[PDB]
Amino acid sequence: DSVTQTEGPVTVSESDSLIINCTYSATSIAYPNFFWYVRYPGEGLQLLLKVITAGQKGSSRGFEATYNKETTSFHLQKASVQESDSAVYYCALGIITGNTGKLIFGLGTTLQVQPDIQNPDPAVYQLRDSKSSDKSVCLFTDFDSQTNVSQSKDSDVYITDKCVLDMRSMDFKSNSAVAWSNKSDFACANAFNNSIIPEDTFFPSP
């Protein structure tokens, strides 16, 4: 008596179509209750959609799933994916027994929806400390979503992974990564060189 779903992680471009597969095995009862739960980043688990009648479909946040009795499935689909859809998705099975409800979850699929940056200007900047001077920080920002930031190889250098910032005044989105070190002879112009950075990346003189 279980649930199987796409392993993932599933990385996809903004506005693209999306299918998350879910197959269920219900040995206890013929037709159980069907659910999709969603865990948004840094939020609590919540009901996305449900189908408590076999053969029917459920809809929410542009997502739809059909309780298909013949294929024993509850595939999640959305035609145009958005950045805020990035979360962990869980297919679940609800069967009642012994007078008490019971709920079996799938492993969970992590969906990562990459925003499309329309006018990217990849740049590496040096930022100075507001108070003291102990180290210096570098910021690689405004690069396109296809670019991946590789982790540090030298144990004295710290390079974070990219994260997507959204200014709520205009619909301005931007990727960025931070790099720092106290190790002497560390330059911002070399900080991110172990990554495959765009050939047009702007390296100003600090």
Of 44 and 199, CB closest to other proteins: 44
- What's the rounded Cα separation, in Å, for the pair 161 and 178? 8
The whole-angstrom separation of Cα 177 and Cα 28 is: 49
Q: Are 73 and 89 in contact (CB under 8 A)?
A: no
Which of 81, 76, 71, 73 shows the shortest CA–CA distance to 12?
A: 81
Q: List Cα–Cα distances, 1 to 73, 89, 149, 187, in angstroms.
A: 14, 20, 41, 57
Work out how close the CB of 185 gets to other proteins at its nearest, in angstroms, rounded to a whole number. Answer: 20
CB of 79 to other proteins, least distance (A): 26
Least separation in angstroms between CB 173 and other proteins: 10
How far is residue 194's CA from residue 127's CA, in Å, rounded to a whole number?
A: 20
Q: Which is nearer to other proteins, 1 or 79 (CB)?
A: 1
Q: C-beta of 159: minimal distance to other proteins in Å?
A: 8
Q: Applying CB under 8 A, which residues contact other proteins? A: 32-33, 35, 37, 41-47, 50, 52, 88, 90, 92, 94-96, 98, 100-103, 105, 107-108, 110, 121, 123, 125-132, 134, 136-137, 139, 141-142, 151, 155, 158-161, 163-169, 174, 176, 178, 180, 202, 204-206
In the bound complex, what is the minimum distance in angstroms from residue 51's beta carbon to other proteins?
10
Nearer to other proteins, 71 or 155 (CB): 155
As a whole number of angstroms, the distance between CA 104 and CA 92 comes to: 6
